[PDB]
Every structure is written in structure tokens, then in C-alpha cells.
Amino acid sequence: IQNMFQTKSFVDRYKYTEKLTGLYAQTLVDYSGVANTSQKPLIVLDNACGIGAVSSVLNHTLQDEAKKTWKLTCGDLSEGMLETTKRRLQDEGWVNAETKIVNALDTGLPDGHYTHVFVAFGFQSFPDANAALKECFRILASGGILASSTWQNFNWIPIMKAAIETIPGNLPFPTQKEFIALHNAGWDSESYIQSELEKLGFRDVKVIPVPKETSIPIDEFFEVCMMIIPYLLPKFWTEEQRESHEKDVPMVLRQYLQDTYGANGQVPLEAVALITTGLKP
Template sequence: MATQTETQTATIPELASQTRFAGPLWLREEVGALYAKGEVHTGPFSMPLLRMANFDKLHLPPNRNLRMLDLCCGSGVTTHELQVLLQKQRLEDKVDLTCGDFSTGQLEYLDKRIQKMGWKNTYTQQMNAEKNGLPDQAFDHVVCAQGLMIIPDSQAALQECYRVIKPGGTFALSVWHTENWSLDVRDAVTHLPGLPAWPETSVELTNSWAQGPWENTHYVRSMLHRRGFVDVDVQTKSIQIPLKDAEDFYEVYDAFIEWVTDRYWTEEEKKACKPLLRETVVRHMENKYGRGKPFAIEKVCILATAKRPEASGNALDLGTPEMDDKGHDSGKEF
């Protein structure tokens, strides 16, 4: 049974200010339901990540429950897949799962999902991933699915993940690699009045929010190694995301499209173009794939797993990297 969302002392606006928040979308109350529509786009990568981390073969510690953290849990797509694995292993009563996110809207949505599904020992907690306030070495394993790259201070968040994992524990993460849906929307946007800007490439899109090139496998491997993790395994996985038709395409990517317009468009462009955006994108996709016809969009993600060394003293704690005035890694620790 779910608990009510636990709120830290800082308010949402205060957290937004503290973390140089990436955009207003996640502050909206309806973001949980909005983001949940996109689970068809994010969800297919959760189970491959969890299996890569061997969470389908969990080993229980003696005399206590296993403790896991689902960081940047969002509306709970990875939480759901974790529950599937726990049920298959008959571990629902032996694993305590904390689901942490910055967005109260998402956590409220997940709270209802937990209650509806009857998931045991599963709790939501509002937290700032850059400074989560959790005790040192509090969790046996941590998973952060498709969240690290959009945290403004991703280096601080990565350090926090290392800090809260017990020695020998596993960290599993996924990040964007290639976002092909954005290229279709880019082409559609050229039909809007005034030609409002849109990311030209997938790399531009992912770098619009990322602090560092998280779409690069070498970078992911290097950052995990730098933080002190060992047994680092980094892979890419391509999945064709099936869509019913052009209308379904817009429904799935609605939150992501909203995200880009918040980042790229002026207030005048939002006023002039947002009322036309859905119709324009749907028409473009119908012209490309056929009206009422199903099609698929390729999405590629990076999946990575790593462990905190058994003897924590073997790894150098590099602390949080120094940032420049734009929130980017100054590189002074390299």
C-alpha cells in the first residue's frame, strides 16, 4: 500500500531555483498523466535495463529486506517493470522500494498507481536528485531510467547515486541516445507561421537539457568510472516504437513536444503557433505514413550498469565537480 508523497522542507519553486530547473513542464499538476502517455516511448527500455542489472536474479541480504531506489521514477513505468520481476521472484514482501522524483505531479500519479496495483513496500518521496537528503549507503541497488541526462547538475546527481549505494551494490541507468521522433516534428514545424525554431538534430535535442554529452557511450562509461564505479557495462539498444497512426504519434510525444516548445519558442511564438501545432504535426505524419495507418519510430537508448566497490575505500571520492556560471562542468577535476 502506498504512502502519501513525502515532501522535503524546500518548496517546488525553491527547488527549481536551487537546481537551475530545466523547464516549467514538470511543475504542472497534470504532468503525471501527460508524461504517462509517453510510456510507450520510454517503457520498452526498462525491462532490458533491469535484466542487464540482474535485477531478475536478486539476492537478499541476511536478516533484513533488500532496499532499492527508483530515482527519477516519473509516472512509474520502471517501477511497474520492477514489480513484475519482484512478483516473478516472489519477493514482494522482501524488497523495500523507494520511488523518488522532483515532480509532485508525477508522484501523485504514481501514488494512485501503487494503490490501484496493490504494490507492497513501495513508497514515493519527493527529492532533488542533485542533493537527495538520503542517508549514506542507504540502498542495495539504485536505478535511474532516462532521467540523469535531464538533471541540470547531472554530475552532482551521479555522485549522490554513488553515495547512497551500499558497497557491492548495483547502479543501473538509461539515457537518450537517438531521438528520431524529433526529426519528424522538426520537418512539420517548418509549415508553421514565422518558422519557429526546433532542434535540427537528435544530438541538439538531447544536449538542450543534458549537462554533458550523455548520448555518447564513451562519455557515459567515463563518468561512471570517474565517480568510482567498477564493473562498468555500457550498451546501446534500438527499439521500434509502434504507433497506431499520426494522432497516436502526437499523443505519445505530447509531453516531449511541449518540453521543446518551452525551451525553444518565444512567448509570441507560443501564442501564435501552439494552437496550430497538433494539427500541423498530425498532417505531416499522415502525409508521410498515410492517414489512419500504423507505423513505427526508432528510438535508441544507452543502457549502463556499474557497481560500487565492495571495499568503498578502494574508490576515490571525487566529490561534486565545480560548475561554471552556466551550470556546466568546469572540467577542473580532470
């Protein structure tokens, strides 16, 4: 049995999906205070780092003096994700950085080691977010900061649903709220997040909704859809529906996007992410 995040097909399209998660990488780094903090040296984990969105921002945002003494660990469960991150580390010239297989549910990392742990769009992807959150608390030093981003709303699932509705068969498709809660519910709620962090002993917890709007060419948006739809069909369609229609999804998506946004058009991306910070005493 495969994990979706470890398949080459998924990793290879993730650069298009990073156009969506990357909307909040600068937000998360800047809201964490890592560029202004009194903690020194910086010991940073990019947890569930993907292809390195947060790590890339950190390397472009932090002072040279701070990078002389910091250590950055880019952690992920997926060997394929880390292979891509490692190429980016080399290409962008990150300093004092390393990739490492890190299971967010059981990191193997030391108690009280990190000044900062970033979890950019990980908690709604982990099998159990609470276990991952407890690990974050364990591995942070006194005074350490957890900074996370999670989805509250976004328009791309509704766009895909509208495309799917142009197929005969009245085919099911998740709502945004269903999609974001497939693994862990609650991470679209400020009050849930605050309560969960506080129950573990985090203090000074802040949860801020941040709206973003941009646009992406239809051909790049198509790749995002193609990365996600195949993992939803076994859950939302019957076997007969898949036999009848799965092969038609690419054409339907192309046609919907061209018809709606233009043959050389741009898809509006609109989202709200919750940007959470908490302090370990």
C-alpha cells in the same frame, strides 16, 4: 516560476510518453541483474521514477520471496508524478513499496543504504547530472548497482521537425542531438558515461547501446508531441513566430501525421538507448 515536470498538463500526458521510455524499462531491470543477484534483501530506489515504469517492471519481474523482504522507494521531484505513481502502486498491487519526494541532486537519503538505484531517463532531464550521479554513488551500499538508461538516438524529434517544416516561416526546431543535450551533454556517448562513472569510483562499468523499434497510433503520438513542443517553442522561436504560428502547431501535427502515416496509421518509433550499469565497491 514553474518546473515543467510539476505541471498537471505535463503529468497528464506522460502516460503517452511512457510508451517511449517504457521501451527500455524491461531492458534496464533485466540488465541490472536485480532478479538474479546475491544481494539480499533488496533495497531499491527508482530515482526520477516518473509514473513508475521501472517500479512496475520490478514488481512483475521479481520473485515473491524477494518481494517479501524488499523495500522499494519510488522517488521523484514532482508531486504530480508521484500522485500518479501512488495510484499505480495501489492498482497493480506493488508490495513493500512507497512513493517519496526525492530530489536526485540532493536526495536526503542515507549513505550506503540501497542495493540498487535505477535512473531511467533521468540524467538528461536533471539540471546537473554529475551532482545526481554523485548522490547515486553516495546512497548505494557496498556491492550496490547503479543502472541507468539515457538516449543516444531517436526518430520522434525528427518527425516533429518534419511537421514543423510544413509551417510557413522556416521555423527552427532542435535536432535529436541538440534536444538530448539541452541539460547534460555526453549521455549519448559510451566513453563519456564510462569515464564519468569511473571517476566517481564505480567499478565494473558497462554501457550497452540497445536499439528498439515499435509503433504507436497517430493519436497517441500526437499527445507526445503536444507534451514536448510547448517547452521547446520559447527556446527555439521568437515571440513574433510564436504569436503567428504556435496556435497552428496542433493542426499542423495532425495533418502531417495523417498525411504521412495514414488516417488510421501507426508512427514507427525507432530509438537507441544506452543501458549503463556500475558497481559501488
